[PDB]
RNA sequence: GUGGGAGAGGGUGGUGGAAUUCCCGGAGUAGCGGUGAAAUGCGCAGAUACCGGGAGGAACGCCGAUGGCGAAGGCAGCCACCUGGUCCACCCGUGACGCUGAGGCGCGAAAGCGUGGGGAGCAAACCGGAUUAGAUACCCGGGUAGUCCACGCCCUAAACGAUGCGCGCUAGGUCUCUGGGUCUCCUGGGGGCCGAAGCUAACGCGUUAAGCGCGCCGCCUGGGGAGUACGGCCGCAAGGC
């Protein structure tokens, strides 16, 4: 049910369309380089849709990873 | 005449002279396509999330400019000829969309 | 695209009177500008059909407006055709 | 005879066979084992017990090179992955980290008919 | 018209990473693969597994959904350019300029055809291995056209909501997309579920009508024969109407 914490509630004022801010977009990624779903981010439809393309831009720039490796399995 | 943002990631192993020459070529190409610069933010070398050109780091440059649209792509090609320049991304400027306000 | 300055230019050029923004002549002139722009866009990129359909719809709308003008006042109809250079 | 004393261990586990390859921290292999290395020949290679035997055999072969600490790397979803994990975990070799690095594509190539109804 | 809005709507160019295959090198040894179980196959000319580098083609993981867009087919990495449709607010302009639509014309998944190119993966036909009473199959190892691209044809479908288009009227509740606003909520457009009246043979439909009405087009008149024959038109052919 993802009752741990919401990324939006665990954050303050920030720009969703900013693709250069890495320390904020790192929080929206999972343990892997995948994009967190709606239940983890706690965003809306439009917010999630903008976040998707901004994360893709940050990945192409080389700031966010396309994929990572799971640890402690 | 639209407003754009240019992100240029190049080799962080360049010395000051080679970096100065690369930035000189960048400014010269911007003048050759009529790109009026409004501001600039040079973040320096930063750690990449994945190796680009066999290098775990990259030197970043950002330019907010205003230029005619018809040659925007035609400018991007000119910035990809330099072997030191390894990433060029041009994005139309957009107003910030703030969340949790 | 079509900026606001060109739109206001053609509107004030084909306005029946200062303030008129929706008369038949203004609509036909705007449709003609859009049609010429789309034809110049479709000379190249000739594989685009979804915009070709919009071109067909604009042509039909302009033809219907010109038919209405022909029915009501043929003088302004001939004047509009002479100013825009339509019908070949 | 290299005396590595610290390396990595790749475990390629499939529904038909599980193979363990012990390499150096740079990826170059030293020794390895699988279900075919053990007396098992046919389908018995896709067995968790066979995977345990292969892991222990590769571990004992790595003992010849005097290796103590390992970094396990897991690839592929097959019967016997966790059994090989538990075999290498208590085999004299110190397991420092377990990493699942199964290569997942971004829907690039078309799979076989056996793996169709997907992309 | 003015000012705003959202979108995998379309076309062109460029560009990103993961993966598969192949090649080069390093390291390394007795099998890998595959199945209910096996064999063909590949491996001492050193495979499989591992690391690094290179090439190439094709498709875009998470986001992603019961979601969005389009007239339908259909559209899913990213960036730029060109471009279509659409919604809302203001009540601003024209002043019935509207609806439908036989023909005509254009678009039209996949497969197929022509020319040229491309060809990694997949894979009709086919070459084999198994299975079986037999296996011209399901299973397994290979593999051509093709899938891909450009241009030109082909007009088919479970082309499906099995529900033609437009307008008006007729209880609501709830979920959601997207605006606007006095932003508990109201209002507009779109996508779902449950249901008033009502309809239906029933299942079910029910402000996204299959309800109540109106306008216009298409089509049906028992089944097989048969979407066959003949004729005509179109098509290089396959064939289609
Ligand atoms: K053999
Ligand atoms: K849908
Ligand atoms: K050929
Ligand atoms: K609102
Ligand atoms: Mg370069
Ligand atoms: Mg096996
Ligand atoms: Mg699009
Ligand atoms: Mg080799
Ligand atoms: Mg083989
Ligand atoms: Mg082979
Ligand atoms: Mg042999
Ligand atoms: Mg030999
Ligand atoms: Mg291989
Ligand atoms: Mg490699
Ligand atoms: Mg090739
Ligand atoms: Mg999905
Ligand atoms: Mg729609
Ligand atoms: Mg469909
Ligand atoms: Mg009025
Ligand atoms: Mg009046
Ligand atoms: Mg119509
Ligand atoms: Mg018709
Ligand atoms: Mg077709
Ligand atoms: Mg086709
Ligand atoms: Mg062909
Ligand atoms: Mg060919
Ligand atoms: Mg094959
Ligand atoms: Mg086959
Ligand atoms: Mg056979
Ligand atoms: Mg039988
Ligand atoms: Mg027999
Ligand atoms: Mg081949
Ligand atoms: Mg042929
Ligand atoms: Mg359907
Ligand atoms: Mg229908
Ligand atoms: Mg029927
Ligand atoms: Mg509604
Ligand atoms: Mg119901
Ligand atoms: Mg009733
Ligand atoms: Mg009932
Ligand atoms: Mg309807
Ligand atoms: Mg109705
Ligand atoms: Mg009869
Ligand atoms: Mg019949
Ligand atoms: Mg009949
Ligand atoms: Mg037929
Ligand atoms: Mg026929
Ligand atoms: Mg005939
Ligand atoms: Mg003929
Ligand atoms: Mg035939
Ligand atoms: Mg035939």
Residues 58-87 of C with CB under 7 A from strand E: 58, 64-65, 67-68, 72
List the one residue out of B76, B81, B47 whose CA is nearest residue B63.
B76
Crossing angle of helices C4-13 and C24-43, rounded to 10°: 130
Tokens of D99: 């990493």
CA atoms lying within 13 Å on the CB side of residue A48:
12
* Nucleotides in chain E near protein beta carbons (<7 Å): 1-3, 6-20, 26-39, 48-54, 57-65, 67, 70-73, 77-85, 92-98, 106-108, 120-124, 139-141, 151, 176-179
Cβ atoms of C24 and C68 within 8 Å: the answer is yes
- Residue pairs between chains A and D whose CB atoms are closer than 8 Å: 15
* Residue D43: strand, helix, or coil: helix
CA–centroid distance, residue D115 to ligand 32 (Å): 21
A21 exposure class (CB count in 10 Å sphere: 0-12, 13-18, 19+): middle
Q: Which two tokens stand for residue C30?
A: 């705007």
Contact between the CB of A60 and strand E at under 7 Å: yes
Method: X-ray
**Exposed, middle or buried, C53 (CB in 10 Å: 0-12/13-18/19+)?**
exposed
Residue D69 and residue D93 in contact, taking contact as beta carbons nearer than 8 Å: yes
What single DSSP character describes residue A36?
A: P
| HEC assignment per residue over chain C | CCCHHHHHHHHHHCCCCCCCCCCHHHHHHHHHHHHHHHHHHHHCCCCCCHHHHHHHHHHHHHHHHHHHHHHHCHHHHHHHHHHHCCCC
CA distance A44 to chain B (A): 10
**Of the partner residues A13, A62, A65, the one whose CB lies closest to the CB of residue B9:** A62
- Rounded CA-CA distance D71/A37 in Å is 31
Pick from D108, D30, A15: nearest CA to D21:
D30
How many Cα atoms sit within 13 Å of D80 on the Cβ side? 25
Say how far residue C49 (Cα) sits from the centre of its chain: 20
Domain holding B6, by residue range, is 1-101
Q: Where are the beta strands (DSSP E) in B1-101?
A: 2-10, 36-52, 55-67, 85-92, 98-99
Token pair 């261990």 is found at D9
* A59 closest CA partner among B89, B55, B92: B89
Positions 6-35 of C with beta carbon below 7 A from strand E are: 7-8, 11, 16, 19-24, 26-27, 30, 34
How far away, in angstroms, is B9 Cα from ligand 5 center?
10
- Contact: A11, B98; criterion CB under 8 Å: no
Show the tokens assigned to C19: 């303030």
Question: Is residue A70 within 8 angstroms of chain D, CB to CB?
Answer: yes
CATH number at B52 reads 3.30.70.60
Distance measured from the CA of protein residue D114 to the C1' of nucleotide E136, in angstroms: 23
Domains in chain D, ordered, with CATH?
1-119 (3.30.420.80)
* Break-preceding residues in chain D (C–N over 2.5 Å): none
Distance CA C63, CA B9 (A): 54
Q: b vs e for A31-68, b when ≥16 Cβ sit within 10 Å of the residue's Cβ?
A: eebebbeeebbbbeeebbebbeebbebbbebbbbbeeb
How buried is B29 (Cβ within 10 angstroms: 0-12 exposed, 13-18 middle, 19+ buried)?
middle
The residue written with tokens 């190796």 in the block is B51
Domain count, chain B: 1
The Cα A40–Cα D30 span in angstroms is 43
Sign of CA dihedral A15, A16, A18, A24: positive
Instruction: Please say whether the beta carbons of C14 and C26 come within 8 A.
Output: yes
Please tell me the distance from the alpha carbon of residue B23 to that of residue C35, in angstroms, as a whole number. 45
Q: How far apart are CA B12 and CA B14, in angstroms?
A: 6
Q: How far apart are CA C3 and CA C10, in angstroms?
A: 11
């Amino acid at each position: 049910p993802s009752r741990k914490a919401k990324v939006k509630a665990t954050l303050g004022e920030f720009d969703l369309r900013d693709y250069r801010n890495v320390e904020v977009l790192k929080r929206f990624l999972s343990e892997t380089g995948k994009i967190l779903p709606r239940r983890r981010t706690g965003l809306s439809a439009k917010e999630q849709r903008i976040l998707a393309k901004t994360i893709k831009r940050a990945r192409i720039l080389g700031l966010l990873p396309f994929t990572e490796k799971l640890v402690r399995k | 005449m639209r407003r754009y943002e240019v992100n240029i990631v190049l080799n962080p192993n360049l010395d000051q002279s080679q970096l100065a020459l690369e930035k000189e070529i960048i400014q010269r190409a911007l003048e050759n396509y009529g790109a009026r610069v409004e501001k600039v933010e040079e973040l320096g070398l930063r750690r990449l999330a994945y190796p680009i050109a066999k290098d775990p780091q990259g030197y970043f440059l950002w330019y907010q400019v205003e230029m005619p649209e018809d040659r925007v792509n035609d400018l991007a090609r000119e910035l990809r000829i330099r072997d030191n320049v390894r990433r060029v991304m041009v994005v139309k400027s957009q107003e910030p969309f703030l969340a949790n306000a | 695209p079509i900026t606001k300055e060109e739109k206001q230019k053609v509107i004030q050029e084909f306005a029946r009177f200062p303030g008129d923004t929706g008369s038949t002549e203004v609509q036909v002139a705007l449709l003609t500008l859009r049609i010429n722009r789309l034809s110049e866009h479709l000379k190249v990129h000739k594989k685009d059909h979804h915009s070709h359909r919009g071109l067909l719809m604009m042509v039909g709308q302009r033809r219907r407006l010109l038919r209405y003008l022909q029915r009501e006042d043929p003088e302004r109809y001939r004047a509009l055709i002479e100013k825009l250079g339509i019908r070949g | 005879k290299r005396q590595v004393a610290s390396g990595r261990a790749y475990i390629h586990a499939s529904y038909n066979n599980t193979i363990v390859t012990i390499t150096d921290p740079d990826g170059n292999p030293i020794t390895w084992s699988s279900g075919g290395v053990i007396g098992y020949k046919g389908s018995r290679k896709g067995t968790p017990y066979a995977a345990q035997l292969a892991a222990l055999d590769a571990a004992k072969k790595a003992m010849a090179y005097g290796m103590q600490s390992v970094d396990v790397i897991v690839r592929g979803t097959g019967a016997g992955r966790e059994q090989a994990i538990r075999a290498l975990q208590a085999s004299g070799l110190q397991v420092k980290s377990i990493v699942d690095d199964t290569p997942v594509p971004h829907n690039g190539c078309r799979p076989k008919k056996k793996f169709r109804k997907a992309s």
